[PDB]
Design a protein around this ligand. Structure first.
Ligand SMILES: Nc1ncnc2c1ncn2[C@@H]1O[C@H](COP(=O)(O)OP(=O)(O)OP(=O)(O)O)[C@@H](O)[C@H]1O
Ligand SMILES: [Mg+2]
Length: 380
């Protein structure tokens, strides 16, 4: 039997869809597509009508490719500036009795934790067992099948204000014709591009998103910090449009097709583009475009450099993994290496520890689909 794993990644610019099939442990990419996101500046959906259709267009495209009808459970991730880390510990005392830890005991405890994390108007999207202690002072890597008299588990969780949660939940409930689970797009991205030795030794994931740049760091298998910089790709595009009387659409087209993270060695070859709201065709050079881009990019990083240090107080054995649309700008890793002074690589599903899904060559190598993959594996 082929069990289906549907996944949606709601971004401020694009909504990515993906459907994976597991059969014998035969991960395959049965369907996938991307669509222009609508109805939300970001964080908030300011036009649920426009937004709901964007999600339906995606759903149509997906169902069509599958020559089927999606009725399986969905895993939907979305981006927010309000995601944050929260911990909680849960303990059990079986008295003098020396009970053996089973999966049941572990899920009860994780459930106890989920409840506790639901407070202060926040609600957990991801939970990670951080450490295990059997009857005070015996750190184990896996408590399962071990007999203890007492057990304490510290959990790390990524939470969101239920205010934001409701917003997405309500609208998606009237669009997705099946139950689902919301997830952080930043955490899922990390889960879909990182490697175990990386999540373990220490690594920083820098998502070069649209409205902002997301920051998340892992150490010892779980995230230890998460934040962002209020500077994203949207700003690089505003910059290009400002310097060149061009429109925002034309600005993005240029960035996507001619942009480069290193301008110093480019040729001054001519590049044409339509002026602001007119046929008036104007012209720039390859180098001038990249000069405008370069500035914005140096800011984004130089600005997220304090995060690098802030976590350094708890790791670059893994360096930085760049993901998101920005990660696709040519030679951006080269710019990042100079700014962060550490090893920099591009994140995508292919360069991860994760299973080598079959028929899935383009999206698995696309940084923009990282989260889509993460959503599925950030579960089972
Ligand atoms: N191939 C590319 N080369 C360079 N820049 C690109 C490329 N593809 C996309 N971008 C840039 O990335 C932006 C989209 O970023 P991204 O794909 O991270 O957005 P998103 O997932 O919709 O947003 P969010 O960060 O809220 O999840 C575009 O506005 C564009 O400027
Ligand atoms: Mg994204």
């Amino acid at each position: 039997k082929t069990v289906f794993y549907t996944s949606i990644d709601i971004g401020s610019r694009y909504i990515k869809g993906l459907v994976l099939g597991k059969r014998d442990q035969e991960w395959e990419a049965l369907a996938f597509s991307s669509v222009k996101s609508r109805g939300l500046d970001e964080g908030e959906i300011k036009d649920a009508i426009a937004f709901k259709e964007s999600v339906n267009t995606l759903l149509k495209e997906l169902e069509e490719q599958l020559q089927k009808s999606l009725r399986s459970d969905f895993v939907i991730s979305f981006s927010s500036v309000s995601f944050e880390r929260e911990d909680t510990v849960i303990e059990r005392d079986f008295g003098e009795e020396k009970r053996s830890i089973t999966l049941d005991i572990l899920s009860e405890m994780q459930s106890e934790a989920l409840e506790k994390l639901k407070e202060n108007g926040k609600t957990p999207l991801h939970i990670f067992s951080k450490r295990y202690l059997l009857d005070d002072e015996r750190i184990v890597f896996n408590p399962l099948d071990m007999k203890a008299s007492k057990i304490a588990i510290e959990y790390t969780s990524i939470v969101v204000p239920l205010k934001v949660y409701e917003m997405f939940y309500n609208f998606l409930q009237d669009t997705v014709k099946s139950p689902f689970q919301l997830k952080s797009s930043l955490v899922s991205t990390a889960e879909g591009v990182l490697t175990t030795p990386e999540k373990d030794r220490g690594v920083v994931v820098v998502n070069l998103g649209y409205n902002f740049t997301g920051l998340i760091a892992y150490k010892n298998g779980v995230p230890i910090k998460i934040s962002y910089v209020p500077v994203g790709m949207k700003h690089v595009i505003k910059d290009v449009s400002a310097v060149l009387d061009t429109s925002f659409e034309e600005s993005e087209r240029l960035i996507i097709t001619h942009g480069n993270a290193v301008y110093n060695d480019l040729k001054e070859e001519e590049i044409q583009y339509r002026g602001l709201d007119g046929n008036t065709i104007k012209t720039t050079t390859a180098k001038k475009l990249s000069v405008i881009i370069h500035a914005r990019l140096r800011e984004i990083m130089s600005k997220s450099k304090k995060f690098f240090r802030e976590v350094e107080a708890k790791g670059i054995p893994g360096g930085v993994v760049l993901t998101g649309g920005g990660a696709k700008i040519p030679r951006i890793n080269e710019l990042a290496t100079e700014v962060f002074k550490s090893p920099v690589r591009t994140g995508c599903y292919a360069n991860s520890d994760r299973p080598s899904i079959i028929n899935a060559d383009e999206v698995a190598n696309d940084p923009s689909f990282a989260a889509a993959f993460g959503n599925v594996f950030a579960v089972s």
